[PDB]
Amino acid sequence: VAQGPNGRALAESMNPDLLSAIQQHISIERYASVTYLAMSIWCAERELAGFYQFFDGEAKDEQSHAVHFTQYLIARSQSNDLQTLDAPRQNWDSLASLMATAFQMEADTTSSIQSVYALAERNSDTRTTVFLDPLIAAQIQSEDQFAYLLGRVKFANGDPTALLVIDNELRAGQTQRG
Amino acid sequence: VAQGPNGRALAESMNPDLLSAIQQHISIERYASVTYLAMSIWCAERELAGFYQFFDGEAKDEQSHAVHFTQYLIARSQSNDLQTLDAPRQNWDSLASLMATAFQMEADTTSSIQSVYALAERNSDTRTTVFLDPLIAAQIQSEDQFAYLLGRVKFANGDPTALLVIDNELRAGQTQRG
Amino acid sequence: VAQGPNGRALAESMNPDLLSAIQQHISIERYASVTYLAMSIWCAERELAGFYQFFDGEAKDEQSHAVHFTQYLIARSQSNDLQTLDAPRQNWDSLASLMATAFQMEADTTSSIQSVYALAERNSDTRTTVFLDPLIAAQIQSEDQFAYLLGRVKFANGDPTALLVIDNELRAGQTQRG
Amino acid sequence: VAQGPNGRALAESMNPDLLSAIQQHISIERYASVTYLAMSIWCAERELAGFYQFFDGEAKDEQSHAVHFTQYLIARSQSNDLQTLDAPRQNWDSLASLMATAFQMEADTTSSIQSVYALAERNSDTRTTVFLDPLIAAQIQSEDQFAYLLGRVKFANGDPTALLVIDNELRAGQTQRG
Numbered sequence: 001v002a003q004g005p006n007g008r009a010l011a012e013s014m015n016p017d018l019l020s021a022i023q024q025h026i027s028i029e030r031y032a033s034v035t036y037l038a039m040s041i042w043c044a045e046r047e048l049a050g051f052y053q054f055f056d057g058e059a060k061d062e063q064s065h066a067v068h069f070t071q072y073l074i075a076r077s078q079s080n081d082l083q084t085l086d087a088p089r090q091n092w093d094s095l096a097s098l099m100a101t102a103f104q105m106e107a108d109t110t111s112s113i114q115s116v117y118a119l120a121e122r123n124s125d126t127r128t129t130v131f132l133d134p135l136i137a138a139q140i141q142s143e144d145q146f147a148y149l150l151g152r153v154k155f156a157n158g159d160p161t162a163l164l165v166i167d168n169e170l171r172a173g174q175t176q177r178g
Numbered sequence: 179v180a181q182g183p184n185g186r187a188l189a190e191s192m193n194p195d196l197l198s199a200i201q202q203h204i205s206i207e208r209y210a211s212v213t214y215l216a217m218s219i220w221c222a223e224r225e226l227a228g229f230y231q232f233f234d235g236e237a238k239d240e241q242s243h244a245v246h247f248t249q250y251l252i253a254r255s256q257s258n259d260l261q262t263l264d265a266p267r268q269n270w271d272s273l274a275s276l277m278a279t280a281f282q283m284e285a286d287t288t289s290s291i292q293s294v295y296a297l298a299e300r301n302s303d304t305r306t307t308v309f310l311d312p313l314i315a316a317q318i319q320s321e322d323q324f325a326y327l328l329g330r331v332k333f334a335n336g337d338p339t340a341l342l343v344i345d346n347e348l349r350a351g352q353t354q355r356g
Numbered sequence: 357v358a359q360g361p362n363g364r365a366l367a368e369s370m371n372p373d374l375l376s377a378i379q380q381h382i383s384i385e386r387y388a389s390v391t392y393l394a395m396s397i398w399c400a401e402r403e404l405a406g407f408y409q410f411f412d413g414e415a416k417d418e419q420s421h422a423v424h425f426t427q428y429l430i431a432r433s434q435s436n437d438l439q440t441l442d443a444p445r446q447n448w449d450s451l452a453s454l455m456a457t458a459f460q461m462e463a464d465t466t467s468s469i470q471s472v473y474a475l476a477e478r479n480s481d482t483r484t485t486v487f488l489d490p491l492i493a494a495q496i497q498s499e500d501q502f503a504y505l506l507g508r509v510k511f512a513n514g515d516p517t518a519l520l521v522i523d524n525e526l527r528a529g530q531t532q533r534g
Numbered sequence: 535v536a537q538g539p540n541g542r543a544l545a546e547s548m549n550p551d552l553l554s555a556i557q558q559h560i561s562i563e564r565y566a567s568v569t570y571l572a573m574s575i576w577c578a579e580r581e582l583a584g585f586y587q588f589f590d591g592e593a594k595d596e597q598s599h600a601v602h603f604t605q606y607l608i609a610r611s612q613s614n615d616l617q618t619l620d621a622p623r624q625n626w627d628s629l630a631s632l633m634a635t636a637f638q639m640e641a642d643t644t645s646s647i648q649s650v651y652a653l654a655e656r657n658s659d660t661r662t663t664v665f666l667d668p669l670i671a672a673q674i675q676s677e678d679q680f681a682y683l684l685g686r687v688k689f690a691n692g693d694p695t696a697l698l699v700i701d702n703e704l705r706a707g708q709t710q711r712g
């Protein structure tokens with residue numbers, strides 16, 4: 001039995017380029033987390049309590065995704081390399097602009113997973129594609145959800161009354177088409 | 179064993195300037211109470227039932243704070259001196275203006291506590307600073323809450339539709355960021 | 357009513373040096389979080405599942421502390437400034453060495469709070485000292501706990517048998533003197 | 535409607551090389567089963583009751599996997615061909631050596647699935663890749679688990695005291711990092 005780079009027994013070696021791609025993706029998940037924290041704060045500063053609660057939870061969930069990836073590297077006997085984390089964006093001129101950035105963040109998270117996926121396929125790493133499959137499925141749901149929240153906020157067309165109604169929807173947990 | 183000014187056994191004497199400051203602060207709490215009663219009436223007169231219910235409860239809570247201070251003076255064997263109470267402000271041109279006065283009242287209540295606190299520290303009265311600590315903590319929460327209600331009302335920008343939505347939030351007990 | 361730097365109604369202005377100190381402390385909490393994540397991974401890589409579970413939870417708790425501070429700045433109508441986050445330490449020669457770093461991290465977290473506390477006192481910011489008081493109390497408990505875990509691991513004196521026993525204690529939730 | 539090789543209605547023909555690969559893989563699952571039975575006996579002979587119970591269950595689970603594959607061939611209207619089964623390895627000089635063989639058996643089971651998977655992809659057999667996906671996911675978990683048990687036994691470094699502690703973990707059902 002061979003030992004993997006992290007010292008554990010090695011079921012199958014991993015291409016170093018794929019390993020690097022996964023380590024970078026963990027940073028993307030962590031960056032999504034702190035981005036959603038910054039968004040939660042921006043909303044709290046404007047008394048948009050439902051949006052604050054929503055993004056506070058999204059921040060925690062993205063962190064959980066990052067940890068989920070660290071556990072996969074452990075399971076593959078690969079080294080983790082937790083990286084320096086950039087500061088998030090923190091300023092927006094409107095809730096619609098914030099929601100556009102949020103949607104882009106979600107879509108960019110999927111693109112990162114897709115890039116890891118393509119590298120795993122090039123390397124015939126079926127463990128990794130199988131690991132990623134349910135994460136892509138979750139991303140479809142999150143993209144659908146963020147398109148819903150962004151589209152609903154855009155429909156409000158900057159009317160504070162409409163934004164208060166939507167804020168109350170989010171506080172109540174009404175965050176998807178359902 | 180010595181007797182304190184109110185006749186009870188005296189654990190430790192209190193500086194008369196500090197005593198006067200606490201008696202004055204009790205009046206501030208009582209004045210906040212009747213101010214919130216006046217605000218509850220103003221809201222009721224305009225059918226803002228959720229704001230009426232909110233301020234009706236705040237009036238009762240501020241009175242409870244006043245009584246809490248009277249009990250501390252009893253516990254310190256100090257005399258209470260219930261003072262003449264000014265009439266509250268009773269007229270506002272808008273709910274936003276009323277909420278600004280409410281926020282100021284809350285902040286001024288904290289300033290009064292802070293002034294008592296500084297005098298207690300100058301007099302090395304650790305019982306009093308310890309007594310006040312949780313009241314300051316409660317004030318932070320109340321200031322955060324009143325900034326939320328004021329900011330949400332200002333966001334409404336005088337639109338009756340938005341103010342009805344917020345009124346219904348308060349009736350439902352949705353009075354904080356959460 | 358004045359507006360604070362984050363746009364909300366301002367109960368009382370905050371010294372910019374104190375604000376900067378709180379923003380820096382939030383980074384310390386976030387850095388403790390990612391440090392404990394790195395420690396959880398190191399333990400998982402060596403099959404120390406109880407230590408992995410312990411530090412996984414500590415990472416989540418430190419993040420919660422960071423968010424708690426961001427909410428205080430919101431409550432004070434002060435701007436948040438989420439900073440770039442350094443990469444954590446990730447390599448240790450032994451569990452005893454890891455636990456020494458963990459204890460130091462906990463003690464350094466308290467020192468950071470103490471530094472903010474002293475600045476608040478210099479500025480007569482009683483809201484901030486009151487906010488910090490229960491966090492210092494929690495730090496005493498965490499320092500006591502980490503001294504217990506470190507001391508118990510050192511008592512094991514590198515014997516794998518003893519470290520397996522302690523690992524099982526942590527998995528069972530036996531993490532303090534009790 | 536066409537009839538498949540096993541006589542049932544045929545949804546889509548299967549490449550004979552892929553069929554042979556699946557039939558061979560069923561033998562690999564059956565061989566893993568009897569290997570884990572032999573390991574359970576080796577442990578029972580040395581009073582390692584927790585390891586005996588663990589491998590007794592693994593033997594049953596691997597047999598269930600074999601049957602699961604036989605049901606897939608039935609579902610595809612393909613013939614099953616249950617093969618002669620080699621005798622398992624039965625002798626080891628130490629528990630660490632046994633656990634190394636167990637880890638290798640688990641990794642080799644995954645390699646067999648991976649080989650079937652690659653053949654299905656070459657043949658555009660999407661039913662088979664979909665069938666195998668959750669089995670690969672289960673293999674990741676089993677490899678992580680066996681790396682944990684092997685690594686924990688190696689950490690014991692042949693100390694009977696440590697091996698008794700781990701034996702008791704397994705008897706209690708503590709068989710993974712968790």
Ligand SMILES: [Cl-]
Nearest residue numbers: 094095096158
């Ligand atoms: Cl908007």
Ligand SMILES: [Cl-]
Nearest residue numbers: 089100101104
């Ligand atoms: Cl951006």
Ligand SMILES: [Cl-]
Nearest residue numbers: 272273274336
């Ligand atoms: Cl208004």
Ligand SMILES: [Cl-]
Nearest residue numbers: 267278279282
């Ligand atoms: Cl006034």
Ligand SMILES: [Cl-]
Nearest residue numbers: 450451452514
């Ligand atoms: Cl050690």
Ligand SMILES: [Cl-]
Nearest residue numbers: 445456457460
């Ligand atoms: Cl260090």
Ligand SMILES: [Cl-]
Nearest residue numbers: 628629630692
């Ligand atoms: Cl051994």
Ligand SMILES: [Cl-]
Nearest residue numbers: 623634635638
């Ligand atoms: Cl062998």
Ligand SMILES: [Fe+3]
Nearest residue numbers: 029062065109
């Ligand atoms: Fe994510």
Ligand SMILES: [Fe+3]
Nearest residue numbers: 032106109142
């Ligand atoms: Fe996401």
Ligand SMILES: [Fe+3]
Nearest residue numbers: 207240243287
């Ligand atoms: Fe009060």
Ligand SMILES: [Fe+3]
Nearest residue numbers: 210284287320
């Ligand atoms: Fe008050």
Ligand SMILES: [Fe+3]
Nearest residue numbers: 311312489490
């Ligand atoms: Fe206290």
Ligand SMILES: [Fe+3]
Nearest residue numbers: 385418421465
């Ligand atoms: Fe902390």
Ligand SMILES: [Fe+3]
Nearest residue numbers: 388462465498
């Ligand atoms: Fe800590």
Ligand SMILES: [Fe+3]
Nearest residue numbers: 563596599643
């Ligand atoms: Fe199997």
